[PDB]
Design a protein around this ligand. Sequence first.
Ligand SMILES: N[C@@H](CCC(=O)N[C@@H](CS)C(=O)NCC(=O)O)C(=O)O
Ligand SMILES: N[C@@H](CCC(=O)N[C@@H](CS)C(=O)NCC(=O)O)C(=O)O
Lengths: 243, 243
Amino acid sequence: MTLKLYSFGPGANSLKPLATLYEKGLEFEQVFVDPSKFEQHSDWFKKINPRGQVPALWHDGKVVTESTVICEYLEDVFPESGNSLRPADPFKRAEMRVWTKWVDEYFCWCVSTIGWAFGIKAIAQKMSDEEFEEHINKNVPIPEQQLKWRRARNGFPQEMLDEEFRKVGVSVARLEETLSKQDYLVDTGYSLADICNFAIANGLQRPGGFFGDYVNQEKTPGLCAWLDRINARPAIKEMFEKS
Amino acid sequence: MTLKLYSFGPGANSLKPLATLYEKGLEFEQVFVDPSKFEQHSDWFKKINPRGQVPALWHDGKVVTESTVICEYLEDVFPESGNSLRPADPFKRAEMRVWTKWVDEYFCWCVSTIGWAFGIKAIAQKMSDEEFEEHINKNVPIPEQQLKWRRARNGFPQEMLDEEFRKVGVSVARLEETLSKQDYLVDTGYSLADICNFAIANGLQRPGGFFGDYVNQEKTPGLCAWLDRINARPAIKEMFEKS
Ligand SMILES: N[C@@H](CCC(=O)N[C@@H](CS)C(=O)NCC(=O)O)C(=O)O
Ligand SMILES: N[C@@H](CCC(=O)N[C@@H](CS)C(=O)NCC(=O)O)C(=O)O
């Protein structure tokens, strides 16, 4: 392979370039970095990405990081491969970037914060207390992430959780505002905007889940039809089938 | 004019498309939205950008918002005008976006938070207490900004300020890490990466200022030479001269 993707599979930030690769029909080696073994903190992976986070794209010896950047990189380099995922119209491509950067600056983080608090409790508590601290202190380069791991194992402040939940509500209302009126986030059709937002939103509609009161047929029919729509796409089904 | 920029002039988020326009030699109407009169919350400006924030680009009846997006839009639409501000090499253009999104997701906000706390005290306190609250409650659409205005007039929590200061330190160390070794943030030369970071960093080196202990010749010679370098560019001098 001349293209390799290092990631956690199809969820959160990893899903963005994974979906992009399958939508564009690009051949690549799908490398699973196993979070249950903290492989993102392994010496061999930090050689690929010294930040110690996924996703990371390897292309002919060059490493591209940041999920949103990798997707734009794939469109910059393979504009003629499979589905075209940025509008040709520059005004529509601008609108697309407003959506993708909003995922990076707002939507991903409130959902993620709730995920760190409740979602990876088992990984977060695998090691003994000192073994945990040993790993964090010498193998997690990123300070903001050191604190997140500590709070994942030991607890997030309550008022922090309350605020994060409110922002999820804001985020879901914003999506519904648009998706209740059109099929995709930019009206030129399916784009990186949909992919980046789907990366965060897919799973929120789970009955009995964390956000069932926010995302459902009654409150957000637009959002739900969009989630269904993207999940019906052949490349998205292929992504989940082969992961 | 077919191009108009609505902004606060050459500082913070407004500086990014302003510098881009001058670097590309593009003709445009420079429209000053006066923050001392809260014009960003005026009915006439919210018609242009319903978010009630600057900058906003008007181009033939189309409005482009988000400072970083506007710069990319100008390169998408006028790639052959004046200085070229994105690398032609897609791997280098990816590296550029890592820098610009890092401004949007980290660097701008810690600097900005300190700015809201200490910087706009006079505007923040212009109106009476009820007149202040009246304006905030009916004329500032954005919730996160309602709270920022309240904290600008009434006070930010101490521990919040301490943390924000630490992140500024992290931000400045990261810049020095690169600029101590090369002239511009991406080694292909001056780009939107430099402009977006300069928008936040310019002014930090002010003697007797907020961040004099972080940014100076002793601690960050690389950062300081870069600041000087960009300030010597003819288009940047022109920007400040004509603002
Ligand atoms: N800004 C980065 C964030 C990357 C990121 O947060 N990755 C998460 C997975 S969604 C991760 O690596 N978590 C493992 C860890 O921090 O230990 C991007 O969009 O790629
Ligand atoms: N994400 C937006 C942020 C825009 C923004 O924060 N603008 C500030 C000036 S730097 C503003 O309008 N402040 C006025 C207010 O919120 O009332 C962008 O990069 O354009």
